[PDB]
Amino acid sequence: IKEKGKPLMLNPRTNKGMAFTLQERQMLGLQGLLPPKIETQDIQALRFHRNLKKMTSPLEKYIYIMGIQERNEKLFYRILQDDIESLMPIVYTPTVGLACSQYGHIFRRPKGLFISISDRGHVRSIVDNWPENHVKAVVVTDGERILGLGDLGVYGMGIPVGKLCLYTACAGIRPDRCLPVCIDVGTDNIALLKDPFYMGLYQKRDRTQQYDDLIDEFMKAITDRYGRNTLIQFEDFGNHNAFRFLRKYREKYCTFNDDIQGTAAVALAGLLAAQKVISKPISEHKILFLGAGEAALGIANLIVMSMVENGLSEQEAQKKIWMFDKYGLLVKGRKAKIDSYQEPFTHSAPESIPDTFEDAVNILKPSTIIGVAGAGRLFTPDVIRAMASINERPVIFALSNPTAQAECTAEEAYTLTEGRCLFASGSPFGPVKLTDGRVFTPGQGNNVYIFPGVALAVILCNTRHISDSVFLEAAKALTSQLTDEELAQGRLYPPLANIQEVSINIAIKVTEYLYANKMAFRYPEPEDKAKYVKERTWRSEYDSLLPDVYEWP
Amino acid sequence: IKEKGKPLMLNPRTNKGMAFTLQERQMLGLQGLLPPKIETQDIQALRFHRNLKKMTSPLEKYIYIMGIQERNEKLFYRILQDDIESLMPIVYTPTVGLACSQYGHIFRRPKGLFISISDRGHVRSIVDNWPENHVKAVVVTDGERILGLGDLGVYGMGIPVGKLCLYTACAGIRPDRCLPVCIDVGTDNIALLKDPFYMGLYQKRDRTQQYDDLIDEFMKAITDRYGRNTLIQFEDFGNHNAFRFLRKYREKYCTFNDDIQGTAAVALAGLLAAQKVISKPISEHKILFLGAGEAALGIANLIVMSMVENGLSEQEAQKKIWMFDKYGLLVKGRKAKIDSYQEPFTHSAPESIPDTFEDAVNILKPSTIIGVAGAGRLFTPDVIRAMASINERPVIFALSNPTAQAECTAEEAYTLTEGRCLFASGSPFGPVKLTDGRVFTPGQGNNVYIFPGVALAVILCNTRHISDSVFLEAAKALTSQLTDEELAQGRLYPPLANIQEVSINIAIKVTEYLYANKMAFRYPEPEDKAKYVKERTWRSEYDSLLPDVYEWP
Amino acid sequence: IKEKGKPLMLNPRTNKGMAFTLQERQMLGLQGLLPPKIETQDIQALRFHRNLKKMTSPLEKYIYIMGIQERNEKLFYRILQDDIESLMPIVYTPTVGLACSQYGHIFRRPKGLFISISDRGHVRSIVDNWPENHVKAVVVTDGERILGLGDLGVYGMGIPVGKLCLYTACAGIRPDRCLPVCIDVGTDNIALLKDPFYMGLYQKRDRTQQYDDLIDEFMKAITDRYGRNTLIQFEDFGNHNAFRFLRKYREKYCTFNDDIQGTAAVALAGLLAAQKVISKPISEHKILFLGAGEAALGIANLIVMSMVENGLSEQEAQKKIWMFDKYGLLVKGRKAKIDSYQEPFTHSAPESIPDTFEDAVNILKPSTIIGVAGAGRLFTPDVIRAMASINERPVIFALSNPTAQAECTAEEAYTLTEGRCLFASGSPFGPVKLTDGRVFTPGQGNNVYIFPGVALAVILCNTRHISDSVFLEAAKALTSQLTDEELAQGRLYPPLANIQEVSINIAIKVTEYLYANKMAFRYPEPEDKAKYVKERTWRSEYDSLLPDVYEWP
Ligand SMILES: NC(=O)C1=CN([C@@H]2O[C@H](COP(=O)(O)OP(=O)(O)OC[C@H]3O[C@@H](n4cnc5c(N)ncnc54)[C@H](O)[C@@H]3O)[C@@H](O)[C@H]2O)C=CC1
Ligand SMILES: NC(=O)C1=CN([C@@H]2O[C@H](COP(=O)(O)OP(=O)(O)OC[C@H]3O[C@@H](n4cnc5c(N)ncnc54)[C@H](O)[C@@H]3O)[C@@H](O)[C@H]2O)C=CC1
Ligand SMILES: NC(=O)C1=CN([C@@H]2O[C@H](COP(=O)(O)OP(=O)(O)OC[C@H]3O[C@@H](n4cnc5c(N)ncnc54)[C@H](O)[C@@H]3O)[C@@H](O)[C@H]2O)C=CC1
Ligand SMILES: NC(=O)C1=CN([C@@H]2O[C@H](COP(=O)(O)OP(=O)(O)OC[C@H]3O[C@@H](n4cnc5c(N)ncnc54)[C@H](O)[C@@H]3O)[C@@H](O)[C@H]2O)C=CC1
Ligand SMILES: NC(=O)C1=CN([C@@H]2O[C@H](COP(=O)(O)OP(=O)(O)OC[C@H]3O[C@@H](n4cnc5c(N)ncnc54)[C@H](O)[C@@H]3O)[C@@H](O)[C@H]2O)C=CC1
Ligand SMILES: NC(=O)C1=CN([C@@H]2O[C@H](COP(=O)(O)OP(=O)(O)OC[C@H]3O[C@@H](n4cnc5c(N)ncnc54)[C@H](O)[C@@H]3O)[C@@H](O)[C@H]2O)C=CC1
Ligand SMILES: O=C(O)/C=C/C(=O)O
């Protein structure tokens, strides 16, 4: 490091608290500024869990652990490392959504960059204000579609912050190379415009061309200072902007959209694991989505790429996918609109026009149901029963987040199908024991299983662009890690407790894929991709800060 | 910049002296720390020239101007840019040599990084001590062969410093992106080892494997911190080491040796200029070298490549070249050793064995004489007359530096050949006027015309390896700028006064060459290379340091 | 030491150069930034004297050593300490006057605080930009009366800088606690108003209420930040502003005017020494001043106090003093003005009014002549001859500075009076050897023998105000250190070569005087004033910058 003395303690990237050794204190001007006691990171972790055990609400736990990231970075991650499964719900979905809807009530310190429409023309100067000189990964949101909570404006900064925590906790990406970003062009949230604690501009969203220019100016500014190959992950943008920005920049920068592409991969991985148990002919596979937005289209497009890779033409596969949105079933010539992306899955109206999602299930008789509407408990008991009656082993994915917007619970899916369904959800649910002793451990179909591993691979290989093919390879890399014993439990995904090793493995597989397809530019090409990746992961163990002292001959 | 206040004035990189505008001083905390007067860089320039003109000795002018580099970087380069031609002999050769032989007496502040054998195993920590974060180019020496002055140890640091100033002065390579380096493993200079002002370790050179490993450690440290693409220019390394390191690293790193390859392109560019005068074919020209070291072998190899590029084969080309070293004519089976690089130019002993260099000229009757033995006035009157009697338009290159080690003077060569010789020297020589009022302006055969333009291209194209073929095009690029009128005056090279435009022009050719030959990795490839290179050269004009202030809507 | 890395080398306060030990280099992040050689201050000193020896002009040597102050403060004073006597003429008078005349030509880096009239209402903001936190002594000037050179505007900043160097070199006052200040309200010097290099405001002097308000503002801003007892020494202000500001502030701040009071003490001390080689009766003392401004009036009033301290009343002592300015003898009723301060020394026109200073010498027949007109050689040979015939041992003091403005030289004084005079001058003159062989060593009556010791005592005792009594004591303290031998050489002051010891002795005696008269507020009162002062003098030897590293039991 460059500085010594108090500054070392005030900066969380370097502060170690009482873990600063005696020599470090004396040589770096800290003696007397710390209590006489010398501690280990282990003692500090104990302090943490000791106090966490006594806390009552998830939000309170969020504020506390999240505060550690602003005081002692190394320890913050040592804490996540100790038990990522139990803390995931706190730092990530669903509690992060809770934090976001209340971001202005719990604010203590800011985190990340805020670029508003009012800064148009001066974005580059905002990017130069960021302290870190070598940013490799950016996660950006404009806060219009925060989880299934809708438009939360700048209160959505909570999402990019959470995603990045996982870049480091899951894939070992250096936190100092990560930058959370929030684009504030206003918010249509009437309640927030009336909140005296709101953190953004008090104006409705700017949807004119100035908005696209702002985004343009941001992509330009970020790459100018950090590099053309800086990984830019779009997160929680509205439906229209999400697809547009993805297609406008995907071939120009090293960018992707988590909601559209990372989701697609995790979902596909779940369906793959499922096919392992079901083993049914793909000619008998009929899928039906509740909702036809970002994730539905992304999932459907990757399912098609999977089916095509498996024989069917692109046109035959798309006919095997249906969608049901807020206006009803997506069929040709319906009163409600249908965008360019939905058309491919908009088919000739069947015998009857289903009025409810239930009718749709009975009429179309799908074998797989995927909920991604973010509208609540729409996979009603009748839907689940209809599914269990129609299929011996129905696949039921309720992916909407947070928990209250989920289509159904694990407990509802398993009991209403007598333990026959193959379930996955976006938000966490604990094990389910049926009235007959059978225990079913549900898996979490959440994009966190993908973006960390993919991001690591892309950064390490100096990749310039990300094609949909990477996510397909990621899908296969995730489900390829499922053992048969975990399959028996009802797990369509590796245990969340192993998310770190699982992410690394996905990173290794994707790096092998990028190189083999001339998508990597990090020369020389590593001989052992496995040893290469593992060798470059950031660790939470304290580094010695002592200067290099030695005797001259 | 991150700081404000006095530090801005203490760091030459940012210090503008009285050039800081009123608004900059108020907002940065300099009000009152500077005189009320607001000056322009133009005024600062005048002050400089006013003082220099009063100065008497070259060394004195050296101390003064080099002192400016450590007070106001921008001003330093503006001063050079003002009149590169007249300042060249002061900051560069021959005065730079004078400075080196006396580095310990005129020392005020150190420049660049010093890595000593005593720091083995701890070289990375030394590299990390360097303030600048984005280093793109390194010029390193061990002071074994400083000009034709010999082993000067750490006193040779003056060379890497002098070389880098030209990177900026000539080719516009950002100064903060440059790093001069001195590897001190001791020195054999008996006198220095007795001087109380010597700046190096008091011990003779370490020629064991430790030297090799130190160099290895250095290459690894630099690359690891700044990127394996970082340009490493080897300068004034002893004979043995110069070749071996070039061979060993040109494949692994983006390195090259200036004394071997840079010179090769200058000397070749000279001959190419001669051709447009003599028109003499390639089946013509019998070349004789005085000395067979780094530069001779380098020029020979590039010459051969140009002949082979024009019909002739390598075997019949290498025969048109002869070398005479401190041991006499280099012929097969002679007593003196003949290294691997010299073998290709070691032909069967002639009918008679040349006793002295004058004899070798009469017997062999060369049409081009090239001196690079750093041994003195060896292109004696007799030697020059002989070349006159034997040729109509003889080519005489006395490239040895500094001035006192050159083979002959511009006057000696022109008067002794009645103005028919085509001359070039390593160090500068003023115009020559013959008794018949005929005036000849001799060019300078110095690699300064090469390394700057090449360095700029390599760096801008993100090149990873430098092939000798880059130098061949470098030579062509240089000569392709010699206008007819300049040929007449007796100029084998573009006027040294235009060395800036020449360098930029060269850089453009090489970048187009590099891309056209898939050696460039800077994406996207620029359509207009010219526009590309000129947009990226560093300017000596002052930049505003004002924060980005603006009103919100 | 709170900073590490390059910053330690860029700051002259901490820069040790190659004297940084290996241990400090490794622990402070300097390894590799300095040559492998470890030097001592002794070696660096040698390098300095070696180069100084070569130099030809005094201004050149000035530019050189003053540059060292801006690079290595410790070494700067070591060099001065090594031979304060020979460097005195270069760093102080007369060369410092030459430097001020060319300040804008030789400018490299600014020194001190610059407060301009354009800054009124923001002076505190300027004072807060000064890097040092504990300032104890300020020396300020407006540059209207720089030596006998006149109005030099901001070019006069060189004077305060020169005085402060002596604060440290002579009295051991801490460099970082001294603050040179230049108040710029414009200049009347027409030459500078058309000089493109002039460092000040381009306007004639502002003499409205604004001037006075600026100074008031300055005085308040300084004390507000550093303390009401911050020693503030006024230097080279115009005659009208010198007395009025001294009168206005001497009871509100810890301030004094060097030109009026310091001079007074050194001049009187010279007379006191003279009396010891003449034993002349007070009733025989007749003093005539050439000039009647700051210096003259200051000296007169101090002489008057010494006489009153010995019996004579104010009235009778005051009549022993005559003055002659640029309009002639000050006699009651003369057409030329006579201000309040001059009245006590304005007599009734004698029988015949002397037209020239020679007529005044012959008519009044004084026994002591003191020149402070700064108008050149007014002590013509006829004048000196007249003094030789009226008095057996004529007292001749040519105090005007620099040398060209002196009233006469040392050679002219001793030669013209045949060695029967007691001579002293404001500027240095070497020894004088008459044809008869006799050698005379002239003393230098310059306020440099006073302000250092006086300021040191005033600072160490936390004195709130300085009365004329202090200077009367300093005057006595200085002459008391004179040893007969030296007095026998023609010395009216102790050898300049020992100004360090002499200054300290004056500091001791003055501190004892301040306490004895309850003017000192430093508590507790030191028992041994000598050990108290000697212990607090700053030293030039290097201090270890090593952190306090120790093991715990
Ligand atoms: N678990 C995971 O990895 C991921 C989960 N999601 C979740 O999926 C939900 C939607 O996200 P996006 O597709 O990006 O949103 P979007 O706004 O792009 O699409 C929403 C879709 O749901 C439909 N919809 C709304 N109400 C409906 C209703 N009452 N009945 C039937 N359909 C209805 C809309 O017509 C629209 O087609 C969110 O809650 C989000 O958190 C999104 C990405 C990944
Ligand atoms: N744009 C860039 O990435 C640039 C990198 N460099 C330097 O190159 C050095 C790396 O050398 P290589 O052996 O080529 O790289 P590498 O093999 O260590 O890794 C390749 C790329 O992945 C990044 N990386 C490594 N670990 C990372 C982590 N844990 N989290 C996030 N990003 C990580 C690196 O910055 C590098 O750009 C670095 O020390 C850096 O200072 C210099 C200029 C630009
Ligand atoms: N391999 C590399 O050099 C990479 C550089 N970057 C980043 O990209 C930024 C520059 O923008 P790009 O469009 O990539 O490059 P560019 O097209 O502006 O220039 C290409 C290379 O030449 C260097 N450069 C430009 N002008 C220079 C000058 N006048 N003197 C010395 N070096 C000069 C740049 O640092 C860059 O590495 C840098 O700040 C760097 O952090 C990111 C990835 C790789
Ligand atoms: N102007 C330019 O661009 C360049 C000029 N030079 C200058 O050329 C000189 C040598 O450079 P390198 O080839 O690197 O050195 P080197 O040490 O590799 O080669 C020296 C050669 O000269 C020969 N030699 C020594 N004394 C001799 C004598 N008394 N009579 C005949 N031959 C003798 C040696 O046998 C040896 O082959 C130096 O003075 C150097 O400054 C080197 C590179 C470029
Ligand atoms: N970093 C800082 O700002 C520091 C400030 N101090 C100051 O020192 C005072 C404590 O008194 P001591 O230092 O024990 O001495 P002291 O009390 O014996 O000295 C009396 C006064 O003379 C001044 N002084 C002593 N030597 C001086 C010198 N060589 N040159 C110029 N001024 C000198 C001191 O500032 C002090 O105000 C405190 O008022 C404290 O504010 C002490 C250490 C550090
Ligand atoms: N050696 C020392 O320690 C000191 C020497 N001086 C020197 O004394 C000189 C005057 O200083 P200040 O009293 O502050 O100046 P001032 O401006 O206050 O007074 C100058 C006096 O000299 C008179 N004068 C000018 N030309 C004259 C002439 N042609 N003939 C007779 N009298 C003439 C003026 O009328 C005026 O009374 C300066 O050259 C200065 O450098 C001042 C302070 C200390
Ligand atoms: O530090 C806090 O808890 C809150 C700060 C704020 O309200 O800005």
Ligand SMILES: O=C(O)/C=C/C(=O)O
């Ligand atoms: O001897 C030194 O290290 C410094 C010399 C200077 O600043 O002139």
Ligand SMILES: O=C(O)/C=C/C(=O)O
């Ligand atoms: O003219 C200036 O501002 C500085 C000159 C120098 O540092 O030499």
Ligand SMILES: [Mn+2]
């Ligand atoms: Mn999302």
Ligand SMILES: [Mn+2]
């Ligand atoms: Mn060289």
Ligand SMILES: [Mn+2]
């Ligand atoms: Mn004065």
